[PDB]
Amino acid sequence: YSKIKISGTIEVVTGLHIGGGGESSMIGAIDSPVVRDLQTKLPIIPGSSIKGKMRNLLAKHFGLQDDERVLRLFGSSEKGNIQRARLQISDAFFSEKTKEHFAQNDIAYTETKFENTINRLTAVANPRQIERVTRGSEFDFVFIYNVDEESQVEDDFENIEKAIHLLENDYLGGGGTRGNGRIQFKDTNIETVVGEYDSTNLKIK
Amino acid sequence: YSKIKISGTIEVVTGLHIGGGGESSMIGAIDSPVVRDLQTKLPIIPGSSIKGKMRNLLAKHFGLQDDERVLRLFGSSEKGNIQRARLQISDAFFSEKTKEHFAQNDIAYTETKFENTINRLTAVANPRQIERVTRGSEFDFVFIYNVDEESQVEDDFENIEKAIHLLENDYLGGGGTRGNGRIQFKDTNIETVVGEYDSTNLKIK
Amino acid sequence: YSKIKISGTIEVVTGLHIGGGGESSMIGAIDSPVVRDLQTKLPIIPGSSIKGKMRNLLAKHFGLQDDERVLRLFGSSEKGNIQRARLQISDAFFSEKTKEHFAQNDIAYTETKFENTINRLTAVANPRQIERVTRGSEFDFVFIYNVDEESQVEDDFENIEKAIHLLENDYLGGGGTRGNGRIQFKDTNIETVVGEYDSTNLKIK
Amino acid sequence: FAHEVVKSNQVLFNGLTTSKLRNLMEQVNRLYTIAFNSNEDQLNEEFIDELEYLKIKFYYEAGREKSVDEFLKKTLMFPIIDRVIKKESKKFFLDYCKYFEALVAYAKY
Amino acid sequence: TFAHEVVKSNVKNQVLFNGLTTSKLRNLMEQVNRLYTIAFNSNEDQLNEEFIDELEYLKIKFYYEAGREKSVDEFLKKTLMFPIIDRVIKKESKKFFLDYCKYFEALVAYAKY
Amino acid sequence: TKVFKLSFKTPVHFGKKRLSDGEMTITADTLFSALFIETLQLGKDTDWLLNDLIISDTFPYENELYYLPKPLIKKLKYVPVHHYNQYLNGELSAEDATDLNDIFNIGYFSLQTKVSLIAQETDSSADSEPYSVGTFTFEPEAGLYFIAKGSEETLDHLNNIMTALQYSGLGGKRNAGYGQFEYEIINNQQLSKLLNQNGKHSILLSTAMAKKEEIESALKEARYILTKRSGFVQSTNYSEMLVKKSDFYSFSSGSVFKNIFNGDIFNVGHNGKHPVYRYAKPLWLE
Amino acid sequence: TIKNYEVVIKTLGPIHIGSGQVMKKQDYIYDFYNSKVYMINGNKLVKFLKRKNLLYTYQNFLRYPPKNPRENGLKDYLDAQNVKQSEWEAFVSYSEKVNQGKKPLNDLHLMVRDGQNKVYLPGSSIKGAIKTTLVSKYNNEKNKDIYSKIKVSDSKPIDESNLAIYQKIDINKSEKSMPLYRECIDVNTEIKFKLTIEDEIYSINEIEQSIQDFYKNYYDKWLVGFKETKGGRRFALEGGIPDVLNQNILFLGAGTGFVSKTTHYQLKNRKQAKQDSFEILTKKFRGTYGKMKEIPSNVPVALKGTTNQSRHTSYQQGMCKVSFQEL
RNA sequence: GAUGAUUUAUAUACUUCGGCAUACGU
RNA sequence: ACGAGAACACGUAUGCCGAAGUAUAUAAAUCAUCA
């Protein structure tokens, strides 16, 4: 058995917003905050959101029940099949490089986009303070892939390529239809952590 | 008859979540809480969870039925082929350092990050609450290894080292494929608490 | 001839589970209750359990087809040996301080740990419930050692503390390999309750 | 304790919505979690400050529209939240949270 | 808890605090909102001197609206805002600033109700 | 004349025929065996046990009041002290007996299930052998007590022996967390008063039989219950292998005799290294 | 069916997407001789006033007003303290061009900026404008499944040299200049974003036709009524009202008009929409519409535009040309 | 000739669901 | 010279699998106030 890492960095092109927890809803302040961390209060991108978006994109690319191609890569919890999710997608963490760059440039880690909704019968609007992580923010992901079958990995990664590439042509997080969460993936090194698999020929873009 | 003690800390990279029991009928809070201690009511990482996870990864590293090394380290209940568990795993509690480090600057002990499961027919969203320990938390693991017969112990520890690596490359607890349960082992010292076995040369990392 | 009462206290380092069998057999209830008083319901450690664990640990220490020390301390009712145990392990009970402390801050005396077993053929998962005593619970041990021969105590206690030492580095109770039943000895006060033997120069911990 | 008020009111608190009730419930859920974090019956001064902030939010949401105002006035929410601090016990706070939760659940029906 | 009585004591048939409209109150509070966001961004209890400078500039905003509008002036007076701002700067503790923010939002909470 | 009171800090395994059943009392032969074995440990003299000591079966007490076995003159098993002044004469209502049976509970019987892993000690591939021990866990401040007679010096001897005994333990599974107790010496005026009664009958309090010459003139005008008493010789030096005691029949406590008998200490052992002294000295409380 | 489009917005009129950051008179310095405004950072200003202990006189310069308690700008204090202009770079954030219509600046609305303090067209705002055109065409806002497919991205960052400030002008009777200056993207600027349509629910031709019909009704029902008001004639002669009928015209940002963001003048006849919108604005705004006894020739009364003195021309707030190119 | 001033401050939804609910050894 | 003595209710077992805090939503409307 073997297992490999895809260590990449997602740069935010258009501010990325993922909903948080119970936060502290202040009267005039932010209403829907980004999820953030707690040990350092820095923005993070949960791996669950990345996996959900990637799986939905791959399914819509293939499936149009479940889709077996998607099942092989994102788990197949059902009565009879049950195959382990090959991709253990991890939470994306606010890189130290972005921290030092934003501290040395007096740029806030997160934006604050005061949005609206007109309700165009009286044009009464609705203030709706919202923020998102600032463009150029880098989140490091360490994607973990499980080599369950030796003679499938390339095929899986083929889907991963689409599941990655079409993700770069797609949003993430909440309200992505309005220019939220546009991201690009950079420095996506591929390396093997367990086993003796040959991942040099592998490439993700 | 010696008893090696692998003592150290495990640090959480992505919020570790080991589910509890039936709790209560809460209708919008603690949808799935983490297992907690009772004397301190602190998050706990049960040694059964580590043993089961390490058992699975070691048996799928060797076997991909019950593999011999995995059986000797963890236990081999059988009709007539039982050999004792030579590696008694132990529960993990918050370190003395972390319990005050997270209190001297008001860092939460656990997270309550939100979740979705939407749908593929109506997009009904259907949220979800998961309680995970805050990243950077240190749990004290005090694993104990019984030296039954001397002249394989080093090799056995080699095996546990490999298993440790897999824990350092995989998840612990629920939802770990969706970026959860990532940890590392550190501050690990090997000593013979009782017995005269020279475990100075033994190394785990 | 004299008697030496080794009183003291034992602290539950991590959850201790000693099975009783006939307490609950319903669907969704606890599948492995601890041994408790029928009406008092306070969890206890039977003296037989401590006696057997100490005898097993001492036999492991000495043998690595019998060694006279263990049978002398615990009994040798064989066909040609038939001895009376020099030490009478007694049942361990909650120290009243533990009871009042747990009652103050509403700490339950027992935990209801939840477990899985899954499967290597289908990974279908399967629930399990195991009752344990609350971490940090503290019990009293009243080991009475009858001095059959004078020139043996200065050896016997050295073995006894060894059986204590091995007991404080090893589990006590069921399912201890998956971390459970770890205990420690403290507050030991060796006394001479009957006879004129000097109990002020003996140590057990 | 909460079924009668919910089912006594198409008609349900005139124009109340599930989203308003869950917006109210978010703060008390956070307080419930942070209380379960603490291991002592007595609530700290920080918890008192969070309870005061809860009252502030509750009053605001009552003010900005009539539906939640009528909902809170009919359910005696303000006297009970004041009694929570006055009694100053974790168990009573948990009972208040359970009462609010029962209100929400009966609102689902 | 100071804000409830002061709001209830200068509201009558309407008029609120001798002409303090909601819009002016939120104009005052926008700076407090942004400082609250910055404070929640920071993980250190001790306030960075830059944040202290922005706090004195919030006080400058308050003085400006007080000197431009009377109703804002007695809203700032009768609610004793400026002494609490002074305590917030002197204390150098984030929790005190958050307490002040909660107290300030209490004002609008009762103003709406 | 003295009364010994016993509070057990642990459950007891006072068996009757097997390890799976445990009673709430030990008859006077068991208590005498305990006292004898303790005297042997202490290295004291045992002549007072064999010639000057009278003891009775163990009887329960529910935290303030003492019981004695029901005289045979329906569902009662132990009658309290303050009811013998009417029960022997025959003035106890059946409703009263039912109420006492409902209220009287000195403890609870617990069939604790254990395992033996000796087979796994050597044959690590073997299997555990489970068994059950039927113990009796006493209610708190509830426990055992008995009446002992003799001279002041014999009583001091017994007090020392029992000072050793409380840490020696009673009953079965003594080394396995059972039988340890603590005793006290207190006087109840009621106990003395019942001990000082007189009457034509004679109620018995310790499993007894007469000598081979006194047996004939003891059974006349008697209604009693007779029991089989057996067991194994608990002795390191009695034999190489464990040997069952020769079966001995005894009058159970609560019997009725027209004329009293002195009783005897019968050697119920075979040609072993040392004798086994079945106690049959009856204590009368008529 | 996935299709991506490069959409170019050419600003025929200045567009300002606000943020609610109505920054007051004390956070800028207007150089009346340079047609420029200098925007400062509050931290730098207060640190400067603390460095030489000028904060103490600042506090009693603000309160206890110096004569007029509303005209006390940033220029009056520095004049009192005789601090020259050539030393202001230590606390000024950035300088921009100002276009009045009347002389100081009253208040400067700050347009939307990201955390990097750069200028972009929000995806949400232009998507809302496009959806306004589409709903004008069809009146289906309840349908939440249609617009889950139309993805609009945030525009690329805009260079600082391309942005200016325009005063709000409300052409009701004459070219009245309002005390509102808003930071706007200059005219004749091409801003490119992405408009992806999924499942081909809306085709490019039909959305373009929806935009054109939206503007057709907008011009025919409300705008033309301003060609008879004298201020309207002056505004049109200055170039503020081009004959751009049957063309791809969108309205973006603040101050574009009630009609430019409401489908009300689309689903009803001009007259009926006029009375109903007059009732709506009477219900909402009692300050002006509550004092009008009779319905005017237009519901939003004054057309919202601006003027540039660098070319002596006028624009109206909102016009932008939208062009699509498939990729 | 000066000056800005009001109104909304998030709204509507989903609030966990599906599966295994202990087995095998004395 | 205690129906007694010797005797761990013990061994194996991941609260685990799948699931996006997501959907919709223009920071907008008003043009007037004072000398």
Side-chain angles (χ1 to χ4, degrees), chain E residues 1-67 69-113:
Chain E
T1 188
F2 192 16
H4 199 127
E5 312 60 19
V6 304
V7 187
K8 88 170 158 46
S9 63
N10 194 327
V11 162
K12 67 101 173 179
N13 316 98
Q14 62 166 309
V15 54
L16 194 146
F17 264 45
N18 209 338
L20 184 71
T21 44
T22 294
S23 307
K24 272 203 284 286
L25 172 43
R26 324 301 300 261
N27 279 36
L28 295 151
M29 202 206 308
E30 181 156 79
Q31 295 81 44
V32 161
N33 297 328
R34 63 185 63 176
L35 301 155
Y36 179 96
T37 56
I38 308 184
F40 256 67
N41 190 2
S42 54
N43 45 12
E44 181 196 32
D45 193 12
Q46 173 157 357
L47 286 62
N48 304 359
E49 204 269 357
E50 202 56 2
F51 181 113
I52 286 95
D53 291 341
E54 213 40 29
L55 202 41
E56 333 204 4
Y57 206 50
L58 161 67
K59 188 163 80 73
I60 291 169
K61 262 92 167 183
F62 273 18
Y63 274 152
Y64 176 45
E65 334 309 358
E69 184 63 81
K70 308 306 173 283
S71 184
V72 187
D73 198 357
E74 323 67 28
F75 167 75
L76 292 203
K77 269 186 310 192
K78 294 172 31 53
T79 52
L80 308 203
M81 306 303 286
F82 293 117
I84 326 162
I85 325 184
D86 304 357
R87 324 201 291 211
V88 172
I89 327 186
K90 167 176 203 164
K91 183 57 50 204
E92 197 85 57
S93 82
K94 206 184 68 143
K95 38 176 201 161
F96 204 66
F97 177 60
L98 281 53
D99 191 17
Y100 169 59
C101 293
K102 308 266 198 67
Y103 157 74
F104 193 24
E105 71 156 40
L107 275 302
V108 47
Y110 323 124
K112 276 272 176 65
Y113 198 9

Side-chain angles (χ1 to χ4, degrees), chain C residues 27-28 125-127:
Chain C
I27 307 297
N126 170 38

Side-chain angles (χ1 to χ4, degrees), chain A residues 112 114, chain E residues 30 34 61, chain G residues 15-24 27-28 37-42 93-96 107-114 117-120 122 163-166 180-185 254:
Chain A
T112 305
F114 210 97
Chain E
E30 181 156 79
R34 63 185 63 176
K61 262 92 167 183
Chain G
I15 54 178
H16 156 70
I17 308 104
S19 304
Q21 289 190 354
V22 184
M23 102 165 170
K24 294 305 293 186
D27 178 14
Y28 65 89
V37 75
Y38 313 82
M39 230 155 258
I40 66 188
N41 161 13
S93 291
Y94 43 58
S95 83
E96 291 182 353
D107 56 352
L108 283 165
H109 287 58
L110 274 193
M111 87 157 318
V112 51
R113 319 175 97 87
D114 57 334
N117 185 358
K118 296 285 100 176
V119 202
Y120 70 62
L163 198 95
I165 280 161
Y166 286 87
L180 183 146
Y181 298 74
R182 43 171 50 111
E183 188 185 29
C184 310
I185 302 168

Side-chain angles (χ1 to χ4, degrees), chain D:
Chain D
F1 51 93
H3 166 258
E4 74 284 348
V5 56
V6 169
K7 297 285 162 219
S8 60
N9 299 274
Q10 182 205 319
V11 317
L12 187 135
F13 298 86
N14 321 340
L16 213 54
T17 57
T18 307
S19 291
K20 280 160 177 125
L21 289 199
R22 297 324 275 272
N23 290 331
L24 298 191
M25 222 187 98
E26 205 68 89
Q27 278 87 4
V28 277
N29 291 149
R30 206 177 42 85
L31 295 189
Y32 175 98
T33 57
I34 206 79
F36 268 2
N37 272 353
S38 287
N39 205 41
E40 181 215 20
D41 197 345
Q42 171 155 346
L43 304 163
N44 319 149
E45 181 76 330
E46 308 181 10
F47 201 97
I48 296 302
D49 297 346
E50 321 285 359
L51 284 163
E52 265 203 50
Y53 158 70
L54 177 68
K55 319 171 194 156
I56 292 325
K57 293 303 292 149
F58 253 97
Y59 279 116
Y60 184 15
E61 264 62 7
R64 32 181 304 184
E65 81 295 0
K66 268 202 73 64
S67 45
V68 187
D69 188 14
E70 174 148 2
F71 162 79
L72 298 180
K73 187 68 176 177
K74 272 202 69 81
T75 189
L76 61 83
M77 193 64 66
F78 297 109
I80 200 167
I81 192 57
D82 183 316
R83 216 157 71 207
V84 162
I85 270 179
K86 290 303 180 290
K87 294 183 178 177
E88 182 46 289
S89 72
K90 193 163 144 295
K91 266 78 74 174
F92 192 69
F93 165 66
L94 300 186
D95 292 317
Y96 163 61
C97 291
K98 292 203 234 181
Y99 167 61
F100 198 83
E101 192 172 58
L103 278 172
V104 152
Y106 295 138
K108 259 189 220 154
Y109 277 51

Side-chain angles (χ1 to χ4, degrees), chain A residues 71-84:
Chain A
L71 289 191
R72 296 171 308 114
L73 263 183
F74 305 90
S76 89
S77 90
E78 211 176 3
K79 293 308 285 220
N81 46 4
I82 298 288
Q83 52 252 60
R84 274 309 187 250

Side-chain angles (χ1 to χ4, degrees), chain G residues 41-250:
Chain G
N41 161 13
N43 274 317
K44 317 294 195 183
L45 176 76
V46 67
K47 149 169 56 58
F48 178 78
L49 299 186
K50 275 208 307 184
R51 272 207 299 100
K52 325 190 306 310
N53 288 135
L54 273 71
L55 172 44
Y56 293 10
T57 178
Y58 217 59
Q59 306 312 71
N60 64 8
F61 162 74
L62 267 61
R63 164 220 60 61
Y64 278 176
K67 198 164 52 48
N68 309 123
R70 193 72 259 182
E71 299 177 354
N72 299 313
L74 215 48
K75 148 140 168 40
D76 312 298
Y77 173 79
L78 304 190
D79 284 351
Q81 286 293 261
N82 294 304
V83 168
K84 273 152 271 303
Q85 160 184 8
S86 57
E87 60 204 67
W88 287 344
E89 285 89 5
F91 64 99
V92 161
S93 291
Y94 43 58
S95 83
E96 291 182 353
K97 176 179 156 197
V98 178
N99 296 309
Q100 290 150 342
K102 319 183 281 214
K103 280 164 190 152
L105 271 48
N106 290 127
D107 56 352
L108 283 165
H109 287 58
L110 274 193
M111 87 157 318
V112 51
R113 319 175 97 87
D114 57 334
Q116 307 201 321
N117 185 358
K118 296 285 100 176
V119 202
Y120 70 62
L121 291 178
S124 58
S125 72
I126 193 151
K127 181 182 181 170
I130 293 166
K131 187 188 64 155
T132 324
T133 64
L134 298 169
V135 163
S136 157
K137 192 69 195 299
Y138 311 110
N139 162 344
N140 41 34
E141 255 276 23
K142 55 142 201 308
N143 216 324
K144 283 189 18 146
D145 254 347
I146 297 303
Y147 290 112
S148 66
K149 305 172 187 173
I150 298 181
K151 308 173 186 180
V152 186
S153 85
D154 279 340
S155 79
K156 283 329 139 183
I158 300 189
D159 45 326
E160 64 201 82
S161 61
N162 197 19
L163 198 95
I165 280 161
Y166 286 87
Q167 193 194 7
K168 179 160 184 169
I169 287 178
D170 282 347
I171 302 101
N172 159 19
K173 307 261 153 203
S174 212
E175 186 99 354
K176 191 160 312 300
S177 59
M178 221 67 40
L180 183 146
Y181 298 74
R182 43 171 50 111
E183 188 185 29
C184 310
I185 302 168
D186 202 2
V187 286
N188 302 324
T189 61
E190 291 106 310
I191 324 163
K192 289 140 183 43
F193 68 97
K194 314 310 154 311
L195 176 63
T196 295
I197 302 96
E198 264 337 285
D199 293 332
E200 286 267 38
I201 169 64
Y202 272 87
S203 68
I204 308 85
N205 55 2
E206 103 188 318
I207 64 172
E208 173 195 0
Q209 202 288 333
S210 301
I211 281 173
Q212 289 170 4
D213 193 60
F214 182 47
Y215 184 86
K216 214 175 186 178
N217 279 333
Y218 174 111
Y219 203 94
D220 156 76
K221 293 190 185 173
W222 166 58
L223 200 141
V224 286
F226 286 129
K227 290 257 178 73
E228 56 92 21
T229 65
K230 38 193 300 283
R233 333 212 201 80
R234 192 146 204 70
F235 183 64
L237 283 195
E238 274 274 281
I241 277 179
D243 193 14
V244 284
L245 259 188
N246 170 16
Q247 215 163 183
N248 300 3
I249 284 298
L250 271 166

Side-chain angles (χ1 to χ4, degrees), chain B residues 62-82:
Chain B
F62 280 143
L64 185 86
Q65 72 281 307
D66 268 302
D67 200 283
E68 197 269 347
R69 275 77 74 79
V70 184
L71 281 192
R72 97 173 74 161
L73 286 159
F74 302 122
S76 51
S77 290
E78 195 70 26
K79 193 54 140 170
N81 204 348
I82 296 188

